[PDB]
């Protein structure tokens, strides 16, 4: 009332692309508890890595690591189907508890992080200045990661549809699409957004018939 325990920085986890996703926002009052359901990046994924982050930078690597931990025992499934509920709970005493539960398996790993873990009053002031200093670079990064994952999904999606299509697909139209997927997957290996979009553009244009079937 003359005083608040607040989170001086945001707390979250790394997600696909090397982006920090925020669970508890900067300048949140303690105690608190926020949960979010995540899934797998790839088919028959048997584990996820929960990499815990303190900071305001959109790039996982530019934020402060508080630890990591694995949740194994993910049963086979298509990617983006499993439910991994990640929850951050900070109690009154200043302790953070990150849990990851497979809502199928009922499996669960926790990690506990001392109130004293992370960046001292100084490193925090730098971190906030550096975030403002790089809202452009981080915008432009985020936009590319979005673009990549969109490309990635469109890649994996177009492969399923070709298998479930099979015989039903003109020889012609399959080749044209085998070429465009090979080109997209190569451009996803790069850092050039425009290049990714143009391979994505190429696939749309030559996929028209695969979509009807599908």
């Amino acid at each position: 009332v003359l005083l608040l325990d607040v989170t001086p920085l945001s707390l979250g986890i790394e997600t696909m692309g090397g982006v920090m996703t925020t669970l508890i926002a900067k300048n949140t009052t303690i105690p608190t508890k926020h949960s979010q359901v995540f899934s797998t990046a790839e088919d028959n994924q048997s584990a996820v890595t929960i990499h815990v982050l303190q900071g305001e930078r959109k790039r996982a690597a530019d934020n402060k690591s508080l630890g990591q931990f694995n949740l194994d025992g993910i049963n086979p499934a298509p990617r983006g189907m499993p439910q991994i509920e990640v929850t951050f709970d900070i109690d009154a005493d200043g302790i953070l508890h990150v849990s990851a539960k497979d809502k199928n398996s009922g499996k669960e790993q926790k990690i506990t992080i001392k109130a004293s873990s992370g960046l001292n009053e100084d490193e925090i002031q730098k971190m906030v200045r550096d975030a403002e200093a790089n809202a452009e670079a981080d915008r432009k990064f985020e936009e590319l990661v979005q673009t990549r994952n969109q490309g990635d999904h469109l890649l994996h999606s177009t492969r399923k549809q070709v298998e479930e299509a099979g015989d039903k697909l003109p020889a012609d139209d399959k080749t044209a699409i085998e070429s465009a997927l090979t080109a997209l997957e190569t451009a996803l290996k790069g850092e050039d957004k425009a290049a990714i979009e143009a391979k994505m553009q190429e696939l749309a244009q030559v996929s028209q018939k695969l979509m009807e079937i599908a």
């Binding site: 696909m16 890595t49 994952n149």
Partner: peptide, 4 residues
């Protein structure tokens, strides 16, 4: 989203 998804984790690796």
């Amino acid at each position: 989203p998804l984790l690796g």
